[PDB]
Design a protein around this ligand. Structure first.
Ligand SMILES: O=C(Nc1cccc(-c2cc[nH]n2)c1)c1cccc2cn[nH]c12
Ligand SMILES: [Fe+3]
Ligand SMILES: [Fe+3]
Length: 299
C-alpha cells in the first residue's frame, strides 16, 4: 500500500474510523465521550458487516446522532433503511434534492434493484423502515453542521457527478468528505478517473470551487479510503485536469470517426475492474457510455 492513502478498515485518525469495505466505506466520527456520527451511506448488502464493525467502537448505538449523506446514488445510501431502525437517535443529514429522491417511488425502485443485485444468495437483509420514513433533516448549501464541540462541518454543493451531490468540509482538520465529485481514485496509477453522470459544466465548476478551499490535509472520497499529503492538497485540481484529459481524448477519437461505443469499451476495459464487486454487471460499461454522451453533448 501507499503511505499517502489509508485503505484499511479501522482507525484512520484520532476521531475517525473506517467501517466495512474500503471500496464502499462508512466513516465513523467520534464527536465526544457519548456522541458519534456516520458519513456515507454504503450499499444495503453490507448492513451486517457495517453493523458488526460499528458495535466494536460504539458500545451504545443510541449515541450515533448524525448520518451525513453526499448523494442519492444506490451505493451511497443503501444502508439507511436497514441500519436506521438500529440507531434510534440518528438524524440523516442530506441535501434537499437527495431527500426528494427518497420520496420518489421510481428513484427508490432503482436504488433497491441495484442493491438487490449485490446480495449473495445466502443473505437476507434486516427489517427496513420505509424510504419516505427515514429520520432526515434537509441541509442547504453553505450550512454549518454543528455536530459536536470539536466537529464543525460545512455543506458545500458539488453538483455534476449527480444533480444532488454535496460535500462536507471540516476546516479544523482540513478534511473534505468529497463523495464522487472528484471521480474514482485509480489505486494502481494514483490518478482520478472522472465520474460525470449528470452535467459536465457543473462537475468542472464544482471542482473549481473546491480548489478554493484552504489547503486540504485529508481528502475522503466515496470509495477507496483516505488520501493525504499531496494527494489531498492537489486532489480537486488533479480531478479537474483528468476530466479535461478525458474530454480531449473523447474529442480526439470522435474526430477519427469513432462511435462513443469504442471509447466506452476501452474505458470499461481499463477502469471497470476496481468497482466490479459493488457495481453490478453491465452498469459500469453503461455508466461509461452515459458519461461520454454527456461529455460529447457539452463539447
Ligand atoms: O457508474 C457508477 N455509478 C453509478 C451509480 C448510480 C447511478 C449511476 C448513473 C446515473 C446515470 N448514469 N449512471 C452511476 C460508477 C462507476 C465506477 C465507479 C463508481 C463509484 N461510484 N459510482 C461509480
Ligand atoms: Fe455516485
Ligand atoms: Fe459511488
Amino acid at each position: 500500500s501507499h503511505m499517502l492513502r489509508l485503505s484499511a478498515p479501522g482507525q484512520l485518525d484520532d476521531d475517525l474510523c473506517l467501517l466495512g469495505d474500503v471500496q464502499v466505506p462508512v466513516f465513523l466520527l467520534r464527536l465526544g465521550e457519548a456522541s458519534w456520527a456516520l458519513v456515507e451511506g454504503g450499499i444495503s448488502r453490507d448492513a451486517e458487516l457495517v453493523w458488526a464493525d460499528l458495535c466494536r467502537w460504539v458500545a451504545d448505538p443510541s449515541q450515533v446522532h448524525y448520518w451525513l449523506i453526499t448523494h442519492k446514488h444506490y451505493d451511497h445510501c443503501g444502508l439507511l433503511p436497514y441500519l436506521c431502525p438500529r440507531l434510534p437517535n440518528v438524524q440523516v443529514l442530506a441535501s434537499e434534492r437527495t431527500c426528494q429522491a427518497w420520496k420518489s417511488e421510481s428513484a427508490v425502485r432503482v436504488v433497491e434493484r441495484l442493491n438487490r443485485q449485490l446480495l449473495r444468495a445466502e443473505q437476507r437483509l434486516p427489517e427496513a423502515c420505509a424510504w419516505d420514513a427515514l429520520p432526515v433533516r434537509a441541509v442547504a448549501d453553505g450550512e454549518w453542521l454543528e455536530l459536536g464541540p470539536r466537529h464543525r462541518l460545512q455543506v458545500i454543493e458539488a453538483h455534476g457527478h449527480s444533480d444532488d451531490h454535496v460535500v462536507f468540509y471540516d476546516v479544523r482538520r482540513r478534511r473534505l468528505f468529497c463523495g464522487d465529485a472528484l471521480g474514482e481514485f485509480d489505486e494502481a496509477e494514483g490518478v482520478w478517473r472522472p465520474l460525470v453522470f449528470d452535467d459536465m459544466e457543473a462537475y468542472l465548476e464544482s471542482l473549481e470551487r473546491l480548489q478554493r478551499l484552504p489547503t486540504l490535509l485529508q481528502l475522503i472520497p466515496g470509495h477507496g479510503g483516505l488520501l493525504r499529503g499531496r494527494l489531498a492538497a492537489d486532489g480537486a485540481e488533479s480531478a479537474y485536469t483528468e476530466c479535461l484529459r478525458l474530454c480531449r481524448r473523447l474529442l480526439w477519437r470522435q474526430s477519427m470517426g469513432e462511435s462513443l461505443d469504442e471509447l466506452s469499451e476501452e474505458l470499461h476495459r481499463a477502469w471497470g475492474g476496481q468497482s466490479v464487486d459493488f457495481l453490478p454487471g453491465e452498469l459500469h460499461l453503461g455508466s461509461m457510455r452515459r458519461m461520454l454522451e454527456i461529455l460529447s453533448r457539452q463539447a
